[PDB]
UniProtKB/Swiss-Prot annotation, chains A, C:
Protein name as annotated: Membrane-bound lysozyme inhibitor of C-type lysozyme
Localization (cell): Cell outer membrane
Annotated family: Belongs to the MliC family. Type 2 subfamily.
Principal subcellular localization: membrane
Gene Ontology cellular component list: cell outer membrane
Function: Specifically inhibits C-type lysozymes.
Domain of life: Bacteria
Keyword field: Cell outer membrane, Disulfide bond, Lipoprotein, Membrane, Palmitate, Signal
Site (Directly involved in lysozyme active site inhibition): S63, K77
Included stretch of the parent chain: 29 to 127 of 127
Known partners and oligomeric status: Homodimer.
Disulfide bonds: C25-C90
Swiss-Prot record, chains B, D:
Gene Ontology MF: a single term: identical protein binding
PROSITE patterns in UniProt: GLYCOSYL_HYDROL_F22_1, GLYCOSYL_HYDROL_F22_2
Assembly and interaction partners: Monomer.
Other remarks on this protein: Lysozyme C is capable of both hydrolysis and transglycosylation; it also shows a slight esterase activity. It acts rapidly on both peptide-substituted and unsubstituted peptidoglycan, and slowly on chitin oligosaccharides.
Compartments, as annotated in UniProt: Secreted
Keyword Signal listed: yes
Keyword field: Allergen, Antimicrobial, Bacteriolytic enzyme, Disulfide bond, Glycosidase, Hydrolase, Secreted, Signal
Encoding gene per record: LYZ
CDD domains named in the record: LYZ_C
Protein's name according to its UniProt entry: Lysozyme C
Length: 93, 129, 93, 129
């Protein structure tokens, strides 16, 4: 069949680093996140649910990697993560 | 160096963290406990390419420079290596700026998930500051 | 000469709508913002300065279009906008 | 309908907005003034393709459904057209949920830029409530 995808150009000439990580949260959910780090920009594409996947943008914090989108906050610390919004604890795997 | 709980509370109190920006002492000892477990040499890599350093796990994308993190802002204008001393001065000072800049203690993931809304005062009890 | 470009894949098959808007702020600054609206995702690419352009993600609010990235908040209301972080009042043109 | 200031304050008081979630009456009248200027029929289009509706300018992407906004969440489960009555009930109820869901009054751009940190009590003065 068919499939069409829209792409956004990331600003700057900095090197782009992409990585997919699988998680499992305390509510049974299991999904995969895509991390994109390029210069001042750092994003996380997260499926906050089965029919909704959001492009989160990295926001300032003291510790960990905090990302924001919609009414959600995806905050990672090492292999761990927490999804706040309607926090849920998730682990890499 | 791994600070003792009360040992850490006394050091933080000398720096003036008690009620610093409205945050009672227990909040700072609590954040350290869950961020680093009182270990001044703790480091942790994150999904954005940054690393957290020190007893208060200061982030290398926003606050310190570790020379290997993309899009570094270095807002505390300090090399991350300077945040790994057995003396918490460098950390306390950057922490004061982080909270002083309105970021609040909410800026620390461990504080948000383990200290916020709890009996933080308990973390300085029995210590005889 | 040359030019290299890294692209981000926007999730879903919803219709994508892009729009470029020029602004002028209270501090004399002048720039152009790119807005991308696709399904649950809404983004604003904003040059928060001369050497830093960030991809902001739309976040929940009661009114206007609030976007977040780094230590900044780009909040629009009609032809007006405000940038918070180191707010500044900006308007279209 | 364009509500008068004091006329609006009295209506909001009857709904229980004074001290609702710890927000004195003045904050709510202030937010309406700068969001819509007390006009219950005000509407404003935004860069994300959404539109703000009513005296409290409730957003079509997050709270109400106007059937023309992409990625609508409709968290107040209500059609935006129902937010344009001269009776502010619908608006007050959705506003209560918005603030009740911890979004605080900080969720309103007008409140944040024109009311926060100001003399909000002034917006209900001389009203006789």
């Amino acid at each position: 069949k068919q499939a069409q995808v829209d792409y956004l150009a990331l600003p700057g000439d900095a090197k782009l680093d992409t990585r997919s990580v699988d998680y499992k949260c305390e509510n049974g959910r299991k999904f995969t996140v895509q991390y994109l780090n390029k210069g001042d920009n750092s994003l996380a594409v997260v499926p906050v649910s089965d029919n909704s996947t959001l492009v989160f943008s990295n926001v300032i914090s003291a510790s960990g990697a905090k990302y924001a989108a919609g009414q959600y906050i995806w905050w990672t610390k090492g292999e761990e993560a927490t999804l706040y919004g309607d926090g849920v604890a998730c682990k890499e795997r | 160096k791994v600070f003792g709980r009360c040992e850490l509370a006394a050091a933080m109190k000398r720096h003036g963290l008690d009620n610093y920006r409205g945050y009672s002492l227990g909040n700072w000892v609590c954040a350290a406990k869950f961020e680093s477990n009182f270990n001044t040499q703790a480091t942790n890599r994150n999904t954005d390419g940054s690393t957290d350093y020190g007893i208060l796990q200061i982030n290398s994308r926003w606050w310190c420079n570790d020379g290997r993190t993309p899009g570094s802002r270095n807002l505390c204008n300090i090399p991350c290596s300077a945040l790994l001393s057995s003396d918490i001065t460098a950390s306390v000072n950057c922490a004061k700026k982080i909270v002083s800049d309105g970021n609040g203690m909410n800026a620390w993931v461990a504080w948000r998930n383990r200290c916020k809304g709890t009996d933080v005062q308990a973390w300085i009890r029995g210590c005889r500051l």
